[PDB]
Amino acid sequence: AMKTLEKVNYKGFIWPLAVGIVLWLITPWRPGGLSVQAWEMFAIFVATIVGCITKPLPIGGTTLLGMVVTVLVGLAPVKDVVNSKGVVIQTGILSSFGNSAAWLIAMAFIMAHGISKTGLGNRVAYVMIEKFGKRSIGIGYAITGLELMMGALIPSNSARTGGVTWPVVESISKSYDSKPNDPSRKKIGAYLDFMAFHANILSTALFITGAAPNLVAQQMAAQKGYQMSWVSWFWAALVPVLVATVIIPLVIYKMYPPEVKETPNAKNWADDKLKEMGPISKPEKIMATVFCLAILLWVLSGFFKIPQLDSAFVAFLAVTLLLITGVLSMEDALHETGAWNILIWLSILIFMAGKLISYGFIAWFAKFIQSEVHGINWGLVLVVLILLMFYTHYFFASGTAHMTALYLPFLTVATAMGAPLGLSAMLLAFTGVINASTTHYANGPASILATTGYVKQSEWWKMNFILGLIYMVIFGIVGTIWMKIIGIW
Amino acid sequence: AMKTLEKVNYKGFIWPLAVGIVLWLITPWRPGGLSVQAWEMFAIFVATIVGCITKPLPIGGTTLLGMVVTVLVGLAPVKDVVNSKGVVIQTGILSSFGNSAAWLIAMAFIMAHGISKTGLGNRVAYVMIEKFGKRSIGIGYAITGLELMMGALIPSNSARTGGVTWPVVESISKSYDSKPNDPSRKKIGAYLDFMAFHANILSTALFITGAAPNLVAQQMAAQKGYQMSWVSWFWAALVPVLVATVIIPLVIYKMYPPEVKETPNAKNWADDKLKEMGPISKPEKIMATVFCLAILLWVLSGFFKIPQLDSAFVAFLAVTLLLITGVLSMEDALHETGAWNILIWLSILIFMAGKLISYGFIAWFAKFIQSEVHGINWGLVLVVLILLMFYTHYFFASGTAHMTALYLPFLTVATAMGAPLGLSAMLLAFTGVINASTTHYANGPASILATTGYVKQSEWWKMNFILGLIYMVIFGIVGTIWMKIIGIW
Numbered sequence: 001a002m003k004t005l006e007k008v009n010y011k012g013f014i015w016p017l018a019v020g021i022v023l024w025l026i027t028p029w030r031p032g033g034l035s036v037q038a039w040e041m042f043a044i045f046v047a048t049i050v051g052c053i054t055k056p057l058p059i060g061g062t063t064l065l066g067m068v069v070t071v072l073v074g075l076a077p078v079k080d081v082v083n084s085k086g087v088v089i090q091t092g093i094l095s096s097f098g099n100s101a102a103w104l105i106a107m108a109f110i111m112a113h114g115i116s117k118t119g120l121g122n123r124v125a126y127v128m129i130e131k132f133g134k135r136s137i138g139i140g141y142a143i144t145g146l147e148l149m150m151g152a153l154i155p156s157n158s159a160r161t162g163g164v165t166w167p168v169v170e171s172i173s174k175s176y177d178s179k180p181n182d183p184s185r186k187k188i189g190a191y192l193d194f195m196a197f198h199a200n201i202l203s204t205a206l207f208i209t210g211a212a213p214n215l216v217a218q219q220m221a222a223q224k225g226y227q228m229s230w231v232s233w234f235w236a237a238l239v240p241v242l243v244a245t246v247i248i249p250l251v252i253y254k255m256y257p258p259e260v261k262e263t264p265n266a267k268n269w270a271d272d273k274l275k276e277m278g279p280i281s282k283p284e285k286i287m288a289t290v291f292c293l294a295i296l297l298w299v300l301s302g303f304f305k306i307p308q309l310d311s312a313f314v315a316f317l318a319v320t321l322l323l324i325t326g327v328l329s330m331e332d333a334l335h336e337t338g339a340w341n342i343l344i345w346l347s348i349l350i351f352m353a354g355k356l357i358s359y360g361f362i363a364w365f366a367k368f369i370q371s372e373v374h375g376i377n378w379g380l381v382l383v384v385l386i387l388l389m390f391y392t393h394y395f396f397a398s399g400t401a402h403m404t405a406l407y408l409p410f411l412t413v414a415t416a417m418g419a420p421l422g423l424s425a426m427l428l429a430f431t432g433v434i435n436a437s438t439t440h441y442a443n444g445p446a447s448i449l450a451t452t453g454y455v456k457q458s459e460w461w462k463m464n465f466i467l468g469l470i471y472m473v474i475f476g477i478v479g480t481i482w483m484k485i486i487g488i489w
Numbered sequence: 490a491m492k493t494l495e496k497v498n499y500k501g502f503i504w505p506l507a508v509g510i511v512l513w514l515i516t517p518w519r520p521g522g523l524s525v526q527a528w529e530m531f532a533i534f535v536a537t538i539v540g541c542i543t544k545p546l547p548i549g550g551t552t553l554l555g556m557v558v559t560v561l562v563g564l565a566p567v568k569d570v571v572n573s574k575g576v577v578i579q580t581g582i583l584s585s586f587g588n589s590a591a592w593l594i595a596m597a598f599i600m601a602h603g604i605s606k607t608g609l610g611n612r613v614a615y616v617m618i619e620k621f622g623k624r625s626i627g628i629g630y631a632i633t634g635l636e637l638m639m640g641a642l643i644p645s646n647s648a649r650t651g652g653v654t655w656p657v658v659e660s661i662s663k664s665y666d667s668k669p670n671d672p673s674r675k676k677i678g679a680y681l682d683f684m685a686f687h688a689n690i691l692s693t694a695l696f697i698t699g700a701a702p703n704l705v706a707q708q709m710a711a712q713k714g715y716q717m718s719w720v721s722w723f724w725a726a727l728v729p730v731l732v733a734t735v736i737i738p739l740v741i742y743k744m745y746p747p748e749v750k751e752t753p754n755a756k757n758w759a760d761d762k763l764k765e766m767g768p769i770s771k772p773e774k775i776m777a778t779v780f781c782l783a784i785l786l787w788v789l790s791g792f793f794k795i796p797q798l799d800s801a802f803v804a805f806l807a808v809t810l811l812l813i814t815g816v817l818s819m820e821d822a823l824h825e826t827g828a829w830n831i832l833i834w835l836s837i838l839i840f841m842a843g844k845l846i847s848y849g850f851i852a853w854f855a856k857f858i859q860s861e862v863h864g865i866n867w868g869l870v871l872v873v874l875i876l877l878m879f880y881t882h883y884f885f886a887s888g889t890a891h892m893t894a895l896y897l898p899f900l901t902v903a904t905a906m907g908a909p910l911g912l913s914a915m916l917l918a919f920t921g922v923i924n925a926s927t928t929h930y931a932n933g934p935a936s937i938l939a940t941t942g943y944v945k946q947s948e949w950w951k952m953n954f955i956l957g958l959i960y961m962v963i964f965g966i967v968g969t970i971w972m973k974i975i976g977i978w
């Protein structure tokens with residue numbers, strides 16, 4: 001029985017529309033050489049992001065609205081058009097939910113629900129609190145150390161974050177009575193959420209097998225005459241990564257402290273809680289077995305590139321195992337809105353960015369940068385290239401397409417302005433990695449951690465812009481000095 | 490806090506596995522000319538269906554398990570492989586959720602949730618009970634008459650069923666206290682569910698614009714030298730369709746009666762309820778406006794083939810309107826499991842059938858029938874062709890691909906055995922239409938109505954096999970006589 005409407009934030013519709021309209025009106029006075037469709041899709045993308053920020057019609061609704069408008073203006077069809085030879089020349093909005101990252105994240109959310117249900121997450125949280133609970137900064141450093149250990153085995157960051165780290169964070173934040181979407185989020189939750197995101201960044205940066213973009217950069221460099229290698233990457237990133245490991249947590253604890261900084265009796269507290277919870281149970285045993293097996297498959301995926309191990313089918317496998325095994329009912333899975341909400345909005349944003357690249361925007365930016373910076377010494381050229389490869393990820397969501405589109409061109413530019421090949425390659429790779437510290441759609445982990453509710457998006461973007469300045473500083477300066485020490489240039 | 494597992498129907502895993510295994514072992518002794526991959530995918534398809542029937546791991550879980558097994562045995566990848574020229578030679582499991590019918594059905598479920606929320610559905614139910622409540626068979630006949638009126642305007646059956654009919658049925662069944670998944674389903678619910686499905690069949694059969702398969706048959710016939718036309722179809726189907734309209738409801742009321750057959754005071758009851766509900770409200774007004782506008786767009790889709798009117802983007806549009814308007818919160822949409830469950834299992838089944846056609850099974854069946862029936866008179870040939878085009882839909886889910894694959898070959902066969910072109914064409918079209926009375930995945934409407942819970946699947950398949958015999962009898966015999974009266978042959 002319904003009487004009145006639901007409260008909507010019509011105020012938030014002011015900024016987006018305005019922006020879009022403005023850019024639309026600017027269409028005729030566009031930079032030139034740019035397709036009008038591209039500029040219109042760009043305006044729509046910007047307005048959609050502004051809506052995600054201002055938060056009218058939560059991310060799901062505003063992204064749905066953006067996709068709808070994209071459909072109305074004729075910028076994107078619904079059914080994949082064909083070239084009469086079988087090729088797809090324009091993908092539709094429905095050919096957007098067939099994305100791997102989205103379904104992976106969703107199934108990982110489901111697995112985490114199963115964890116929290118069987119009681120395993122609480123156990124792990126009370127354990128890591130027994131051992132690191134004192135000085136919650138210790139908790140942050142434990143999770144970042146865990147992520148760093150895992151980066152060497154699991155080559156899909158989204159997995160480490162949604163299947164391993166995020167459950168830990170949720171369990172701990174539940175044990176400290178820090179529930180999201182409340183003022184009690186700032187107790188300890190947001191600290192761990194943000195630290196986990198940035199630790200995932202560090203892990204991705206330390207190991208060449210931290211994600212697909214790194215392999216893409218490896219392939220492209222080898223295409224331009226320079227062979228990366230697991231040991232080279234590690235030996236070049238070890239130092240800057242440690243410097244970041246030491247600085248980042250400190251600046252975060254100074255800028256975003258958890259209101260609960262000391263639990264001096266956490267040891268006896270956790271021991272009492274573990275004694276009350278009783279011994280380990282059968283469903284907990286089964287869920288642990290499944291989690292370990294899925295971890296094993298995600299690892300095997302790094303050495304054997306096989307469809308049976310795509311890092312998403314593995315999640316489908318683990319969840320159907322939870323179903324056949326009884327620990328998880330299908331009704332429990334059809335619940336857990338987070339999965340489907342992510343599916344929706346992440347897939348839509350990725351599709352919009354794909355249309356942004358297909359219509360010729362990013363290619364024009366590459367060509368413009370190629371044609372603009374001519375008479376400068378290779379150092380300032382490297383500086384500008386890095387800054388651009390950083391602040392361009394605001395127009396991307398994959399992390400892979402960004403490199404696929406802008407690595408080889410930037411590398412060619414640098415090598416043409418005298419810059420040495422190895423330095424340029426590794427710097428641009430580290431930059432393509434640390435892009436993540438911009439947005440909530442940069443990569444999977446950000447989409448997971450910046451929307452769960454522990455962190456408002458405004459704080460996210462601010463702190464991430466700052467930490468991005470810091471990441472650029474560290475990597476550029478120090479990693480350059482270090483790659484000079486060992487003979488990378 | 491979890492202690493014990495959830496109760497699973499491990500018994501239901503007996504039949505499927507067994508079946509699959511058997512067929513797998515039969516692989517080497519297959520009919521010949523058939524790809525081994527095809528036979529294995531066929532076994533997996535059959536086992537998945539047997540699981541859907543026996544109902545272990547409800548449809549979602551068993552279909553997930555089937556997709557997983559399909560992935561493990563190397564019959565389907567996860568990411569669309571490419572031909573080095575851009576073409577897709579094998580689609581993956583993730584390129585299965587980009588289906589129009591599934592997302593359409595889901596968004597229609599969402600719209601229906603909004604309806605039931607604002608109180609509009611109850612209003613409509615009490616109205617149609619004031620006017621037809623007596624002799625609930627009257628209710629069945631009102632909904633079938635409604636569907637018949639709509640078939641002329643809305644060329645997507647899934648829409649008529651999930652956006653219009655199914656909400657009516659749910660509202661009425663709620664007003665009579667017939668809740669699904671309970672013994673109180675047989676009060677009036679199942680009767681209306683089944684009658685609505687079969688009325689959708691009749692509407693699809695009466696008008697050439699009842700669905701895409703009819704247009705496909707029109708195109709293919711015109712390809713083989715015979716021009717269908719809206720008036721020809723209607724004048725040839727009017728009589729058999731009326732005979733079915735008169736027989737079907739009767740055999741259903743005799744075979745599946747609603748335990749509540751008379752509400753002699755339904756008029757005063759409904760009037761009292763409408764007076765208590767109060768006047769019409771603002772959100773009800775808005776929801777009605779949106780429903781009417783979506784109906785309008787679905788209609789316009791029949792004359793202008795335009796991406797802005799794909800009959801699914803329209804549903805996205807209506808639901809985002811409900812969101813921006815306040816009648817519907819995104820949390821309400823992320824709920825309503827039915828949508829996502831349908832998405833999952835329908836998309837998976839459609840993908841499996843697509844792999845069944847791609848690997849060369851259906852083509853082999855067509856070739857075999859072409860090479861087998863040679864020395865028979867055109868009448869018995871027509872009979873066999875019709876029976877096959879009926880009992881083949883058990884190996885399909887689209888309704889469109891079935892015709893796209895088996896219409897022109899069957900038509901060529903018939904025309905080669907002497908049969909006249911117009912008769913063969915129209916008969917095979919009517920048969921491709923009435924296929925729906927087999928399964929729960931035949932077309933959208935069946936997937937909607939046979940899984941909501943008002944009807945067990947066993948009863949569904951049984952009664953639909955019977956009514957399929959009856960549909961074949963009616964159409965073949967009587968429609969043949971009628972098309973002979975008017976000069977179709």
Ligand SMILES: CCCCCCCCCC
Pocket residue numbers: 015019046050053
């Ligand atoms: C919160 C207001 C955000 C407006 C930013 C508009 C900047 C558009 C840059 C392209």
Ligand SMILES: CCCCCCCCCC
Pocket residue numbers: 504508535539542
């Ligand atoms: C309920 C048992 C169902 C068994 C059906 C087996 C049919 C196989 C057809 C190929």
Ligand SMILES: CCCCCCCC
Pocket residue numbers: 308561
């Ligand atoms: C249950 C794990 C499946 C791994 C597939 C490997 C097949 C060669």
Ligand SMILES: CCCCCCCC
Pocket residue numbers: 072797
């Ligand atoms: C909602 C329908 C808009 C279609 C506009 C097409 C104008 C040529």
Ligand SMILES: CCCCCC
Pocket residue numbers: 016017020021024044047048051062065066069
């Ligand atoms: C041009 C208007 C865009 C609105 C996107 C929410």
Ligand SMILES: CCCCCC
Pocket residue numbers: 046049050053394395
């Ligand atoms: C305020 C953030 C705007 C982002 C533009 C892409």
Ligand SMILES: CCCCCC
Pocket residue numbers: 391394461465
């Ligand atoms: C390029 C846009 C950067 C804005 C960061 C808040």
Ligand SMILES: CCCCCC
Pocket residue numbers: 505506509510513533536537540554555558
């Ligand atoms: C070969 C066995 C398949 C079982 C599918 C549920």
Ligand SMILES: CCCCCC
Pocket residue numbers: 535538539542883884950
């Ligand atoms: C595919 C045919 C299986 C149906 C079982 C009744």
Ligand SMILES: CCCCCC
Pocket residue numbers: 880883950954
């Ligand atoms: C292929 C025919 C199956 C029928 C089961 C009712």
